[PDB]
Design a protein around this ligand. Sequence first.
Ligand SMILES: Nc1ncnc2c1ncn2[C@@H]1O[C@H](COP(=O)(O)OP(=O)(O)OP(O)(O)=S)[C@@H](O)[C@H]1O
Ligand SMILES: [Mg+2]
Length: 260
Amino acid sequence: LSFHRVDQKEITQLSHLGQGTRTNVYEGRLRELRVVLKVLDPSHHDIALAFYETASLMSQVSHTHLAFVHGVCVRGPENIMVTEYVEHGPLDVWLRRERGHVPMAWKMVVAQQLASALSYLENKNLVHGNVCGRNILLARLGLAEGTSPFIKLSDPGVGLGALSREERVERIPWLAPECLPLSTAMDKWGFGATLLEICFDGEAPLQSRSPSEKEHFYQRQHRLPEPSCPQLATLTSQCLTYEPTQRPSFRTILRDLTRL
Ligand SMILES: Nc1ncnc2c1ncn2[C@@H]1O[C@H](COP(=O)(O)OP(=O)(O)OP(O)(O)=S)[C@@H](O)[C@H]1O
Ligand SMILES: [Mg+2]
């Protein structure tokens, strides 16, 4: 309910960027700010409500590493979330294109930035539910001498609670295992999975596997792979622990990363 209604006349739709979860995403302009326009598919009212819920919740938080949500445009039957365009796009796509050339120090800066934003959300007691490399956007590349990367975590889109089992399974291994059959504990697991994804240059474990085989992995409660670095491995394994209450707080995660 508490979100800004963007007028259709204030937005200009440019190029199609990709399909998202129940969406098509376009570059746009907001009268001018550079934005993305997330056009909801024709949906049951409960999906639209979950879409509105995200826009409302995201409009009331602020963080240097959270992408802005400008509001929602209702254009006839259409529902369009209007969010900040982040210059260099998704981290996973970028890492895959740049693989082999990204130092561990760079990855540790990015990790700390993400842990900072999630520590703030944990404090606000706000569930994200879609922490993954595709949703970490690069505002600054930080490869050049004297530079440092700068990320922004985007909104979760249609809230996890409204999605089907099939699309929850597709979100494995970022999806917390307790969510397969809503606590901020789930974002600790997504963080851990995103750290693995980053360490492996944008390739998450279990992505060459079928949906039924991802589901089976969780049902057997197999442990996800560890990175080579034992301190980093200690943190990822702690985050990627099946019992949610055994996952460390983001205050603790943040402290551990700062020493790395
Ligand atoms: N904030 C942004 N800035 C720049 N490009 C973006 C942004 N958000 C999305 N994109 C682009 O749009 C494409 C589709 O984005 P997705 O994140 O897959 O869509 P989505 O509607 O947010 O669905 P999710 O993340 O499953 S809830 C991405 O591959 C990016 O290239
Ligand atoms: Mg997204």
